[PDB]
Amino acid sequence: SLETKKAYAARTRRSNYAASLRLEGFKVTFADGERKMPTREEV
């Protein structure tokens, strides 16, 4: 269960955070949670 719990979290965390951003008012859709993410290279 532990290894499956970590596997489930890794599968869903990126989509869940995009949804969590939407709850805070950020203009983020479901497709944004599925997109590739850029690397950390803050401008």
Partner: protein, 182 residues
């Protein structure tokens, strides 16, 4: 507020950003990448667990990422550790909701979410860090979780209802976000 720039409402950040619009886009992007590096961890959960999530999310922008509120807003700062300890101790006494059926888990998670929300440990970013913790809480209990189950307007009203002690709107939120067993 001391967390903000002098004569402004924008919080001081590591990138020296001074208007609120460009800081949200920087915060949204940089914290999203960080959210993709948070792994599920087993209980016991705690305030320090919550702080660890907040630090991972916002350490690229705020020095106080992971640190607790120093000013008031809610539970005042000097009582936040006591109040969070009460909540997490009660959650631990209930085996972190493991063994509970779906119907029971929904009512307990809804009440636990509002209780922790009243603590409000951080100057900013409380909701996002809290929901990642509740993601781990629900899948440790053994159930799927997706915040796409509700929209923003429903989420705001459920939290307002919870401020006034009415939890039924918070319960149907988790009724719609908690799914099948893993």
């Amino acid at each position: 507020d001391a967390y903000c720039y002098p004569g402004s409402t924008v919080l001081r950040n590591k990138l020296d950003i001074h208007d609120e619009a460009t800081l949200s886009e920087a915060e949204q992007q940089l914290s999203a990448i960080a959210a993709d590096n948070v792994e599920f961890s087993p209980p016991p959960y705690s305030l320090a667990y919550l702080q660890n999530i907040h630090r991972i999310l916002f350490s690229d922008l705020f020095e106080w990422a992971g640190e607790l509120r120093t000013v008031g807003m809610f539970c005042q700062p000097e009582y936040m550790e006591k109040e969070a300890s009460k909540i997490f101790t009660a959650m631990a006494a209930a085996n972190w909701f493991e063994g509970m059926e779906r119907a029971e888990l929904i009512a307990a998670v809804a009440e636990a979410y509002s209780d922790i929300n009243v603590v409000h440990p951080f100057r900013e970013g409380n909701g996002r860090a809290q929901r990642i913790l509740f993601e781990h809480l629900i899948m440790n209990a053994g159930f799927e979780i997706s915040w796409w189950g509700i929209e923003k307007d429903e989420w705001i009203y459920a939290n307002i209802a919870a401020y006034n002690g009415v939890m039924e709107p918070m319960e149907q939120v988790f009724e719609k976000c908690i799914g099948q067993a893993i």
